[PDB]
Design a protein around this ligand. Sequence first.
Ligand SMILES: *[C@@H]1O[C@H](CO)[C@@H](O)[C@H](O)[C@H]1O[C@H]1C[C@](C)(N)[C@@H](O)[C@H](C)O1
Ligand SMILES: *[C@@H]1O[C@H](CO)[C@@H](O)[C@H](O)[C@H]1O[C@H]1C[C@](C)(N)[C@@H](O)[C@H](C)O1
Ligand SMILES: *[C@H]1C[C@](C)(N)[C@@H](O)[C@H](C)O1
Ligand SMILES: *[C@H]1C[C@](C)(N)[C@@H](O)[C@H](C)O1
Lengths: 5, 5, 7, 7
Amino acid sequence: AXKXX
Amino acid sequence: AXKXX
Amino acid sequence: XXNXXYX
Amino acid sequence: XXNXXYX
Ligand SMILES: *[C@@H]1O[C@H](CO)[C@@H](O)[C@H](O)[C@H]1O[C@H]1C[C@](C)(N)[C@@H](O)[C@H](C)O1
Ligand SMILES: *[C@@H]1O[C@H](CO)[C@@H](O)[C@H](O)[C@H]1O[C@H]1C[C@](C)(N)[C@@H](O)[C@H](C)O1
Ligand SMILES: *[C@H]1C[C@](C)(N)[C@@H](O)[C@H](C)O1
Ligand SMILES: *[C@H]1C[C@](C)(N)[C@@H](O)[C@H](C)O1
């Protein structure tokens, strides 16, 4: 786990 | 460019 | 983007 | 930590 930007 | 963690 | 996360 | 950012 790891969403983003 | 990456304060975080 | 241009930010981060993590969502 | 364990999360992200960027602050
Ligand atoms: C996340 O940010 C921290 C603080 O700057 C860095 O030490 C770390 O390299 C960075 O993590 C990167 C590499 C990773 C942990 N494998 C990825 O999951 C993360 C999204 O980006
Ligand atoms: C997310 O940003 C941190 C800080 O600059 C970097 O250390 C890390 O490499 C970066 O994560 C990479 C890998 C990714 C999470 N799969 C990508 O989504 C991200 C843009 O680049
Ligand atoms: C970034 C780290 C986190 C918050 N623990 C994870 O849940 C996310 C999807 O990636
Ligand atoms: C991560 C990206 C960002 C939100 N544009 C920046 O302000 C932060 C310090 O690093």
